Point group: C3
Chain length 123, copies 3
């Protein structure tokens, strides 16, 4: 292995889910989806061990046609990330395509409380 | 909604299409596609309300195998965008995948004047 | 063509393959894949004519679930690329999607010496 660079990169826990019982999360998610049917509610939290800054607001109401890439730029600005700093999103531990819409990701991956959960990391 | 960040992001009008009649655009597009069959002609214009700079040249003749991402970097340089500034492309209001080729996008979306139309924005 | 910007962008040769015979490369690749089945061995080299810097280490042992995009950021750091500088990866002359995993790319494109070959360029 001496001639190789060994690259080192599931333990995600959303504090929103730790702090608030499922039934209360679902009551909120259902109210939002009924009132704003063209938008999707998203919880965005930092992955453990990520040395990147913590995001100030975790709850977003996003137009369904907004892409991952457009949302990346919004989140980058909120964290005040420098251009040289990396940011990756994970939905159920998988990085989505940058051109996927938030509506598509919500339809495919929202949990039964009607939220889409996104983790972010710098690696 | 107080605990949510409400994210706010079809009205695109290409001045190339406003200024030049369809028949003249098509005559030009057909001549280009006949003379340069391995290239695609592309019109690139800024979306309304985008506070980003206006692009100096709007007409591009692009190798069919060039990707969206390679073209992004070219356009970023022409606008003199800083690395922290965002740039998104839209074809018929949809952001294409970064690894799609311009030839694929042309085949799927060129208009009957034989041009591919790309709008760009900072959001 | 006067009103058009003519955009100008297969000749790739991996020095790893020039310097080391196939049988020796394969012996190494097979040993690595047996010992580290959840990782993939990757050779990363600069494309000809690319004015970008040369990469210091060419051999990487990568987790199979790491994405192209995560690997991009690693390679960008090793080259000391500024944020305004472009970097593109090519596997058999094709830029892969940023959300593809290295395991997927390896399964689809590894050569019979059990290495995945990636070229990089600034255009």
């Amino acid at each position: 292995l001496t001639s190789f660079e060994l690259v080192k990169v599931g333990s995600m826990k959303f504090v929103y889910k730790e702090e608030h019982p499922f039934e209360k999360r679902r009551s909120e998610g259902e109210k939002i989806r009924k009132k704003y049917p063209d938008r999707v509610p998203v919880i965005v939290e930092k992955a453990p061990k990520a040395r990147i800054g913590d995001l100030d607001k975790k709850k977003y109401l996003v137009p369904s046609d907004l892409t991952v890439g457009q949302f990346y730029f919004l989140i980058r600005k909120r964290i005040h990330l420098r251009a040289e700093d990396a940011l990756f999103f994970f939905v159920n531990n998988v990085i989505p395509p940058t051109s996927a819409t938030m509506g598509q990701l919500y339809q495919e991956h929202h949990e039964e409380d009607f939220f889409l959960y996104i983790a972010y990391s710098d690696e």
